[PDB]
Ligand binder design. Structure first.
Ligand SMILES: Nc1ncnc2c1ncn2[C@@H]1O[C@H](CO)[C@@H](NC(=O)[C@@H](N)CO)[C@H]1O
Ligand SMILES: Nc1ncnc2c1ncn2[C@@H]1O[C@H](CO)[C@@H](NC(=O)[C@@H](N)CO)[C@H]1O
Ligand SMILES: [Mg+2]
Ligand SMILES: [Mg+2]
Lengths: 136, 136
């Protein structure tokens, strides 16, 4: 699993066209104030142990940053060892579930299987942009 | 070399704190309308052949998108096989130079060696977010 952590002042997205023949989530749009935005690429070896490590790390980082909102943003573009779409969706659902057991704020999982527009204002501090790899 | 291509409606950044003991570029800030924003991670094996392939691809993609501005945005976070900072700066300077021989619009290379804030409004169309790997 490959993650990009962006500490944002604000974040918003809208689904536009479907990117899979049948997207497993309904279309939608949402906008947020200060949040940790976690661009999340699910990779072929990812299982429940991987999900648990990512969830702990996201919780830990969110705590460091004093953020109370996390956005789990499905993202196909951070790796060249992608999990298949079905498996990726399952892991992202597991990741959201796991994160809620570790982090007490708003957890928003954006819809999987869509092209999206988005806007982000990303902070400039030294810990505002980080990437993470998790495996088992 | 690992690149992320974001087709934006608008883009802006500001350098904030230095991220290397001596950043090789001066601090600054800039803002843009519609542009291809190319988050660019220079990797250990990257040489002039790699730079030339990336430059051709960026030019080709920009042409497809009908964009007339490209932003080469140094980014440390797309890979776990980073080139050293000196070498990375050199390759990014080469990449800007190479791109200008292939693409006729505005080419902006953002400063290397800084933490930056930024904002982006990324389009939602199917070719609006892509990643690319180049090697030699
Ligand atoms: N292995 C994977 N890890 C994370 N997300 C994945 C995935 N495989 C497929 N997706 C999702 O399907 C859309 C089309 O690839 C993807 N959409 C996106 O990457 C949008 N942000 C594009 O605008 C994403 O929702
Ligand atoms: N191998 C590499 N490829 C591309 N850029 C690289 C690099 N090694 C160092 N940099 C630059 O140094 C700043 C601190 O890592 C980096 N700064 C950034 O990644 C900012 N956008 C953070 O806000 C970047 O300017
Ligand atoms: Mg809508
Ligand atoms: Mg300034």
């Amino acid at each position: 699993m490959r993650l990009l952590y962006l500490h944002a002042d604000r974040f918003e997205y809208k689904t536009v066209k479907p990117a899979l023949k049948n997207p497993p989530d309904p279309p939608g749009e949402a906008s947020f104030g200060e949040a940790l935005v976690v661009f999340t690429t699910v990779e072929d070896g990812d299982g429940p142990q991987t999900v648990m490590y990512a969830a702990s790390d996201i919780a830990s980082h969110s705590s460091r940053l004093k953020v109370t909102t996390v956005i789990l943003y499905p993202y196909a573009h951070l790796s060249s060892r992608l999990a298949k779409p079905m498996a990726a969706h399952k892991r992202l659902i597991e990741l959201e579930g796991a994160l809620r057991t570790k982090f007490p704020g708003h957890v928003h999982r954006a819809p999987f299987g869509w092209y999206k527009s988005f806007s982000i204002a990303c902070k400039g501090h030294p810990l505002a942009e980080l990437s993470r790899s998790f495996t088992e």
